[PDB]
Symmetry: D2
Subunit: 146 residues, 4 copies
């Protein structure tokens, strides 16, 4: 992932203001609502019938916080995402068999959640920076398939 310092500044500044405990659950929950086939991976989480059921699921919220945590991790090592994510790649690919396209969709939902939250501060160049990051993390997660 190649970010200019201006880009690195703007991404981290935005990041610093993310409600980590909420954003994660919102991004995971919206993934399940918007791209419904993804619910197949989380059937053990309980009731996912309605959007309300999904958005209200505390297992979804809890897990969402864990996803956001790893995201914060890659953000700290843009230099080496493959290695940062090596362990999560074996899990998601070798054990869970998640389609590589799903990693890209979660990336997308995340960018949407930020736009939604940071309105005007989510500028075109900031959107561009985050797009490159979510793409970099998605590619690092599908590494086991490469």
């Amino acid at each position: 992932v190649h970010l200019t310092p201006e880009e690195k500044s703007a991404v981290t500044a935005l990041w610093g203001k993310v409600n980590v405990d909420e954003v994660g659950g919102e991004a995971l929950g919206r993934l399940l609502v918007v791209y419904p086939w993804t619910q197949r991976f989380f059937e053990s989480f309980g009731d996912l019938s309605t959007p309300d059921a999904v958005m209200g699921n505390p297992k979804v919220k809890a897990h969402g916080k864990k996803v956001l945590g790893a995201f914060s991790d890659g953000l700290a090592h843009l230099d080496n995402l493959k290695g940062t994510f090596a362990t999560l790649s074996e899990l998601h690919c070798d054990k869970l068999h998640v389609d590589p396209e799903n990693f890209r969709l979660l990336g997308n939902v995340l960018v949407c959640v930020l736009a939604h939250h940071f309105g005007k501060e989510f500028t075109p160049p900031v959107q561009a920076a985050y797009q490159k990051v979510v793409a970099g993390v998605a590619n690092a997660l599908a590494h086991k398939y490469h």
Copy 2:
């Protein structure tokens, strides 16, 4: 596209509140900035070299407004997206030769712009409905390749 009563009422309500000037140049600008290869289609527009040049450009802004106008038309005929978009399909496909994937990328940018432009009212079910709409439009636009 298949929208549930709720989704459709939902959809058409928010649309009515859309500031096309704001959303159109924003959607079009963000496409050229986030996915740079898209600039080659708009060489006739001038200075697109920087996010500022792009976001500044009134050609971009005016064209953006035209794109939303076609969207609106589309929104009125969710029943016949294909027929609604026939002439634009011929233009984009047969004449311009735009990659069908780019119709998906504009759609996604547009969704991020609505999140951005409706904050709190852009709930998971609304995003889910708008995602079906944009995918529907992208598919109707790529119709000539099918």
Copy 3:
């Protein structure tokens, strides 16, 4: 799907030379080997651990011929794919939750299988026509998501 009369004639002539009992198993099996996350959907098939575990799997072979039968249906009803695949769309979308991208991969694998089998009779325009067909089928199977 829009085929010119020359496309329709060549597509239908080639299809009549296909050994159904065989190409369907070959296409489903290659899908499972080349895009390994797809194995997660074939819950009762047993060992899918090695290419030979997959390719000679009796259930893969039997199942491939049912897939092939459905494709034939498709080809015979290009004017009505959504209707033709109505119950298969609800099974795959509503019940099985197959990601739409997967429908596309299987179409791509089938095309490769025909190339492998027909060699030189698989000309560029025949390939282009088959591409439009498999894309139309994938689109009709993902109907319930639209």
Copy 4:
């Protein structure tokens, strides 16, 4: 790209029987026929009006030879695709603005041309190996967008 030695050997062994002078032109030509929007990049090659026109084009055949030449380089340097394709990445991204999805499509057409050529030598594990190589080359080519 992760290839087992078994895969590596099956891959290089087959590459050795490729008609260097022909497969390239076939691949490129089928790209232009099957995904017609790619014709916009080769409008200076002359007449691409028809499949026959495309497949006939001597510019296409000559250019296919160079493409295949680049592929052999990648094959010879699986451990250094990014360096191997450094200059080609700057040409295609920075200079030509080719959409990254098109690199993917070319790799896919190539695999189909190999299938079409090798019949039976093109077994499921060989196809899987080739799919990982093409994906790795497409990703290396798109590096400038990352």
